[PDB]
Design a binder for this molecule. Sequence first.
Ligand code: BCL
Ligand code: BCL
Ligand code: BCL
Ligand SMILES: CC[C@H]1c2cc3[nH]c4c(c3C)C(=O)[C@H](C(=O)OC)c4c3nc(cc4[nH]c(cc(n2)[C@@H]1C)c(C(C)=O)c4C)[C@@H](C)[C@@H]3CCC(=O)OC/C=C(\C)CCC[C@@H](C)CCC[C@@H](C)CCCC(C)C
Ligand SMILES: COC(C)(C)C/C=C/C(C)=C/C=C/C(C)=C/C=C/C(C)=C\C=C\C=C(C)\C=C\C=C(/C)CC/C=C(\C)CCC=C(C)C
Ligand SMILES: CCCCCCCCCCCC[N+](C)(C)[O-]
Ligand SMILES: [Fe+2]
Lengths: 246, 281, 301
Amino acid sequence: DLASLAIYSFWIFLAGLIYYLQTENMREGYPLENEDGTPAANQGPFPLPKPKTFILPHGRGTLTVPGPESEDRPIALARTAVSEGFPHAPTGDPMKDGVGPASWVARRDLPELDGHGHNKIKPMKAAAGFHVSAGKNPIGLPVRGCDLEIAGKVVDIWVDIPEQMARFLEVELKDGSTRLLPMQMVKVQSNRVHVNALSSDLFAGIPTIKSPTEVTLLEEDKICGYVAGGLMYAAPKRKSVVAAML
Amino acid sequence: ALLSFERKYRVPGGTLVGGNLFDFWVGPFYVGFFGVATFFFAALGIILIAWSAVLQGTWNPQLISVYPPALEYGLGGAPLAKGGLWQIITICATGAFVSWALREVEICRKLGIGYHIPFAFAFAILAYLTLVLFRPVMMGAWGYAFPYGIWTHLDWVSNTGYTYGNFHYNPAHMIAISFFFTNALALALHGALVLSAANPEKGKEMRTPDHENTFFRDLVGYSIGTLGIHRLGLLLSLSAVFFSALCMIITGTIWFDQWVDWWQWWVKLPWWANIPGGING
Amino acid sequence: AEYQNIFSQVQVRGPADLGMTEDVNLANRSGVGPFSTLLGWFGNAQLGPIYLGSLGVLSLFSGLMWFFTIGIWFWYQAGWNPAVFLRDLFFFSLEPPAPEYGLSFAAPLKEGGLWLIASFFMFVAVWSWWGRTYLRAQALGMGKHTAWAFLSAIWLWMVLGFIRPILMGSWSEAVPYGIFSHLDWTNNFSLVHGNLFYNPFHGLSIAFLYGSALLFAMHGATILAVSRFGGECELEQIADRGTAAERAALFWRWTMGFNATMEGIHRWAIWMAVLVTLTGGIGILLSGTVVDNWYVWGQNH
Ligand code: BCL
Ligand code: BCL
Ligand code: BCL
Ligand SMILES: CC[C@H]1c2cc3[nH]c4c(c3C)C(=O)[C@H](C(=O)OC)c4c3nc(cc4[nH]c(cc(n2)[C@@H]1C)c(C(C)=O)c4C)[C@@H](C)[C@@H]3CCC(=O)OC/C=C(\C)CCC[C@@H](C)CCC[C@@H](C)CCCC(C)C
Ligand SMILES: COC(C)(C)C/C=C/C(C)=C/C=C/C(C)=C/C=C/C(C)=C\C=C\C=C(C)\C=C\C=C(/C)CC/C=C(\C)CCC=C(C)C
Ligand SMILES: CCCCCCCCCCCC[N+](C)(C)[O-]
Ligand SMILES: [Fe+2]
């Protein structure tokens, strides 16, 4: 019976598809390791796939995966238990050590280019023709932290050119320097931009960028990881929902 | 065992219950209060199911079925082997589904990401709940809910649908279907674009988001954009399920007849309902 | 409250983006359309430019010809009365030639001829469009992933109105062009084949149809949950993994015990979707050619 031969063959195929698919999704993070950083005994039923090489745009290089774990920097965490399966506590300040919800990856320290070879991200000031076309323009607004204190003011919008999307808010601090705040981590309100993730006193610590007109992937990550980390690590400094309604 | 880049993330915190008591992992899984609450509900629920299997007299996965209380019982309890098990199992599934979401949230808090996932899942829980809890209640009987059984529930759909003729005519159902098809379409399209860009013709440099936009514009005159496509995928599938719940919550509560008849409201519109000709003329 | 990134808070707009050139014949690319601040809240606000070579022109032409062929029949069925046209719009139907005509093109226009004509246009429209999805990718040096995935959809389409009808021996088997009628046809198809729920491939197609809604909700929610790290920049996250890709991967690993990679998730996605009409196409093709009653068939399996 064809129908039978068909449904039979399909399951073989499906199992192989899942197999193939699964192995493809192991081009990162594998082989698995034991909490102490050594090869974990069990690696699973699927074996690492044949490596593939990604020829990066603009001779930025090549990415070969799977390959050796690119992460080698120090992790400021200490084991909290002899047996595997438990948390590893921050040895210092997690926000600054870049661990936990505030982790960041050591991505390439160059800004991402678009199809035409121009920095994918630019401050509006420098984006020819770009302007706010709808919605409350955030620029000029005071930025408030979870502590309900002003941490600065928005001096510009960093735009993702290809996507014609707002990516960050450039916030000037009390000392006159600026920091980039992830657009999706700020709430643009009518009379101010609110940042629930961070308290005024933490804005200073947002990783800064090298060049004031571009941001690199490494910087992006460091800025994003840090701002997210605040949700957890700034909890004591954050005010209540009722305090915010005053 | 951890991913080669995981350790730095396994920090304490994020739990919503029991401080650090359950804050830990078992292999790749995070436990947390809701990790145990889920295992509890899951096991108790699976146990009660195997039990019903016993009382039903079979171990065949294809045959095991747990029906809800017959219409007679309306909205009260019922003998474990005749409506009660299904009733406790439903609670065990709900508890397990809610606990699964709450577990996700804790995970969200520990990783510092948004709560979109468990939020989206909630829609599934709400759809299931619509079939098993809300519609039944509004109809006055757990009997109206579906049976937990690989095929019996398919039979349930068939019989429930045909109760109103061809369920295809349920307008809510049509919108839902459109969302499911549109979704699969969006999903294929999305997965295909990212891949076509990441895997250009052999020998070429990875394409860029500019190539993605350019490809779709050249093709269709529009590109929703990376953020948009995910917003869309989420909106599409969540809308599908939302309209699924809707198409059902109204069937048997505010609409009882053959759905095909519902469309008569349009045909009978006073200004043409009588013009001879056409199909309805 | 926090902002869940569902709608952009502020829209930005730069000059119209004419996109990449690569090997694209810019002579066949129109000018930029207008900008929709509406769309802009959800995705790009920019409409156009669109590329329309010969294949594209052939496709739109046939496509419109198909559409209009149905339209004229509909108007005919309405007695050319706009009021009737509008009230019975969903009830009109351009049906294929009766079984009597088998796979012949002798059917009188009013009885299968128009349908045959409309189908010819549709056939050309769809296939020429497929070539286009291939050629547009080729001009940008991209993978043919779209063309291939489109085939899977084309597969179900071809099976329903061409392949199966032929195998069955008559155009009467095909699907009629009408909103409700095509639904009636679907229901009827199940009825006539012993309930499609017993079709294993129909069960699969549903698993993948649900799975697509399940997976896209997952993927979309994930990406949005890590967009605070630029997770939407998937191609970028693939070439240079970031905490966004790691946190997305770990959420799922910690939740269900396994995870994906920024690139691999799209492979799951493309197959989840492609399998929908792939299995489904098989389900249908087998119906009436090899299996007359799925309940019956199911009993011996
Ligand atoms: C003859 C039958 C009738 C008919 C009768 C009905 C009836 C009756 C119903 C539908 C419903 C639906 N119909 Mg219909 N339908 C017909 C023909 C069609 C056609 C078609 C091609 O013709 C299509 C595309 C549809 C499409 C649909 C979907 C929109 C909808 C189901 C999805 C849903 O709600 O999920 C919702 C999501 C869930 C239910 C999942 C919940 C998951 C839970 C939260 C988690 C499970 C965890 C698990 C236990 C753990 C597993 C272990 C792990 C794997 C390890 N119908 C015909 C005409 N249809 C249903 C609907 O609207 O439902 C609300 C419905 O009730
Ligand atoms: C409103 C829609 C109807 C409905 C209509 C249909 C139709 C129509 C079909 C199915 C089919 C299936 N349904 Mg159903 N189904 C409903 C509600 C449910 C619920 C639930 C708790 O609400 C569950 C768990 C299922 C589960 C299933 C799967 C066994 C099966 C194919 C997998 C699939 O589509 O995955 C989508 C999800 C994934 C691919 C992710 C992984 C999910 C895994 C595959 C599901 C495991 C289910 C498991 C066996 C249940 C036992 C759990 C143990 C007791 C712990 N249905 C409601 C009542 N269902 C198909 C089939 O073949 O049925 C025989 C089918 O054709
Ligand atoms: C009473 C009716 C029967 C039934 C009869 C059928 C039949 C008959 C079929 C399905 C099919 C399907 N059924 Mg069913 N089905 C039933 C109940 C269900 C239920 C349920 C109760 O919950 C569910 C979830 C489903 C689900 C499904 C889907 C998995 C599958 C359709 C995929 C699809 O739409 O591709 C849609 C995609 C296409 C049709 C691709 C073709 C598109 C072409 C290429 C593009 C045309 C473009 C065109 C020119 C117009 C251009 C538009 C402009 C650009 C705007 N069925 C009941 C039991 N079902 C289909 C299948 O494969 O089954 C195995 C099918 O044939
Ligand atoms: C809301 C829109 C869509 C969606 C989204 C969605 N689903 C989700 C999520 C999201 C965002 C998750 O985060 C979560 C997940 O973690 O996935 C990996 C999940 C999930 N969606 C799942 C299934 C699923 N989703 C479906 C649908 C959808 N999910 C929608 C299309 C379907 C169907 C029928 O279409 C199914 C089968 C699970 C794999 C997973 C949630 C896992 C979970 O809750 O585990 C806790 C519980 C157990 C391990 C056991 C419970 C056992 C008993 C207590 C009950 C079972 C008895 C009975 C109710 C079952 C009857 C079965 C018969 C009908 C066959
Ligand atoms: C002109 O009037 C004004 C208002 C402008 C416009 C009015 C137009 C209207 C109202 C149009 C309405 C169109 C509708 C309702 C279309 C609906 C289609 C539906 C509901 C479903 C489609 C299913 C179709 C399928 C599965 C078609 C498959 C076709 C093929 C596989 C091709 C078959 C080709 C054949 C038989 C020709 C053989 C030719 C050769 C040699 C290749
Ligand atoms: C009946 C047609 C079946 C088509 C199946 C096509 C699935 C698309 C898979 C995308 C991967 C493509 N590839 C070759 C570039 O790796
Ligand atoms: Fe994606």
